[PDB]
Amino acid sequence: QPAQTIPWGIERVKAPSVWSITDGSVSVIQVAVLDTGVDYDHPDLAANIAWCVSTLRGKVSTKLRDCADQNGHGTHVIGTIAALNNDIGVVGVAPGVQIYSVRVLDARGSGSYSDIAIGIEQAILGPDGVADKDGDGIIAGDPDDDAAEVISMSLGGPADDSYLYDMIIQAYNAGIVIVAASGNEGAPSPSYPAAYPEVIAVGAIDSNDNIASFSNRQPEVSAPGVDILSTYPDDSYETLMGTCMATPHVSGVVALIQAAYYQKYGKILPVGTFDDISKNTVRGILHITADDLGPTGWDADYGYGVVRAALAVQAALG
Amino acid sequence: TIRVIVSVDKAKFNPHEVLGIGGHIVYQFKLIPAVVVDVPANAVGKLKKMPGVEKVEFDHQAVLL
Numbered sequence: 001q002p003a004q005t006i007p008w009g010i011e012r013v014k015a016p017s018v019w020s021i022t023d024g025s026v027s028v029i030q031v032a033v034l035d036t037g038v039d040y041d042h043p044d045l046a047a048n049i050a051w052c053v054s055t056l057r058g059k060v061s062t063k064l065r066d067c068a069d070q071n072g073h074g075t076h077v078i079g080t081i082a083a084l085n086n087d088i089g090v091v092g093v094a095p096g097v098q099i100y101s102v103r104v105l106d107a108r109g110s111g112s113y114s115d116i117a118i119g120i121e122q123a124i125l126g127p128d129g130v131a132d133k134d135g136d137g138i139i140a141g142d143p144d145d146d147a148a149e150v151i152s153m154s155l156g157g158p159a160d161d162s163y164l165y166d167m168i169i170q171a172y173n174a175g176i177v178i179v180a181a182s183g184n185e186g187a188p189s190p191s192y193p194a195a196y197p198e199v200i201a202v203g204a205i206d207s208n209d210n211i212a213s214f215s216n217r218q219p220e221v222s223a224p225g226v227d228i229l230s231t232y233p234d235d236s237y238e239t240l241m242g243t244c245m246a247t248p249h250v251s252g253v254v255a256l257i258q259a260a261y262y263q264k265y266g267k268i269l270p271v272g273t274f275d276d277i278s279k280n281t282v283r284g285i286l287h288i289t290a291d292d293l294g295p296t297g298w299d300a301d302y303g304y305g306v307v308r309a310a311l312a313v314q315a316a317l318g
Numbered sequence: 319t320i321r322v323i324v325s326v327d328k329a330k331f332n333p334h335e336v337l338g339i340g341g342h343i344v345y346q347f348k349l350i351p352a353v354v355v356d357v358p359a360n361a362v363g364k365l366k367k368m369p370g371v372e373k374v375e376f377d378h379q380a381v382l383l
């Protein structure tokens with residue numbers, strides 16, 4: 001195992017200075033990552049993996065051979081969110097946050113809509129199989145439920161108006177922040193599910209704050225997505241680029257906001273809207289504390305700008 | 319068999335009737351009124367026709383971004 005380094009993107013989103021307040025290890029907070037699975041025993045991830053599940057072929061399974069990452073994409077994304085702050089490897093945006101690895105994609109990154117919908121449902125139900133155990137209508141942010149507070153989606157496709165979108169809406173309504181990559185084609189707009197108003201579309205910047213040429217335009221926010229070092233199978237590390245590497249930086253930032261807010265107030269913030277410019281919702285706080293790059297205000301390259309955990313948390317707690 | 323996702327009116331749909339047309343239930347969603355079913359491609363008409371069945375979606379491929 002290599003000595004720990006802090007990847008540049010972790011510093012760019014202003015995560016490390018938040019860790020004296022919270023590293024995300026507030027017990028009610030989980031981040032569900034719907035992706036290719038996880039290297040569940042990776043030494044720089046294992047302690048943060050709260051649930052390792054697969055919904056492949058419509059069967060909910062925690063068997064290790066079903067849930068283990070065969071691609072590497074899920075492992076890398078999970079690492080950016082939650083690699084442990086210790087003596088090895090890398091360190092996540094929220095290096096103390098619990099992770100649900102929900103494998104919805106096979107070795108080749110292929111899956112079916114039904115398995116993705118079941119994966120979203122699993123993130124809401126949590127390991128107990130029940131969305132709202134005490135029936136109070138509080139799901140995300142309820143310490144007596146086990147629902148995830150953030151869902152990080154590594155999918156791209158055309159518009160859906162079916163049971164799948166219905167499931168995304170249920171997650172939003174449960175108070176869960178949903179995050180997805182704008183896409184990697186340099187196209188004029190975000191792919192789905194990033195394009196839904198319930199979901200934060202994330203674009204990619206390089207280390208000089210240039211928008212990446214591959215980053216699909218009109219995102220909601222942007223984040224480090226070029227030359228991103230993170231965990232990779234087997235107990236290893238890899239450097240990748242993509243709006244999909246930008247996405248976990250934002251998920252990690254959301255986890256820090258909700259962990260710090262809950263730690264202070266015993267509740268979480270409402271998710272909010274793409275339009276939001278108040279301090280009263282997660283997305284509001286993300287938008288107003290983002291580094292406004294490019295033309296003043298929201299623009300087609302950067303969205304609201306580059307997310308910043310230090311400023312976001314300060315806003316949330318003040 | 320093909321895999322489909324059925325939107326249902328829970329007040330009228332009878333899931334036990336699925337077996338008769340040669341299908342089986344794969345997963346019943348807890349949070350939306352839908353069920354994934356495997357059904358021979360040719361009972362799809364019979365399925366669409368069953369009481370409480372509102373919509374029949376084919377399963378579609380998702381791809382990693």
Ligand SMILES: [Ca+2]
Nearest residue numbers: 028030146147
């Ligand atoms: Ca939770």
Ligand SMILES: [Ca+2]
Nearest residue numbers: 084088089090
């Ligand atoms: Ca580490």
Ligand SMILES: [Ca+2]
Nearest residue numbers: 125126130146
């Ligand atoms: Ca639950």
Ligand SMILES: [Ca+2]
Nearest residue numbers: 132136138142
């Ligand atoms: Ca509850």
Ligand SMILES: [Ca+2]
Nearest residue numbers: 134136142144
């Ligand atoms: Ca409760």
Ligand SMILES: [Ca+2]
Nearest residue numbers: 039041042235
């Ligand atoms: Ca391993």
Ligand SMILES: [Ca+2]
Nearest residue numbers: 293295297299
């Ligand atoms: Ca701007």
Ligand SMILES: [Zn+2]
Nearest residue numbers: 319342344356
């Ligand atoms: Zn079957």
Ligand SMILES: [Zn+2]
Nearest residue numbers: 375376377378
């Ligand atoms: Zn369809």
Ligand SMILES: [Zn+2]
Nearest residue numbers: 242244382383
């Ligand atoms: Zn990707």
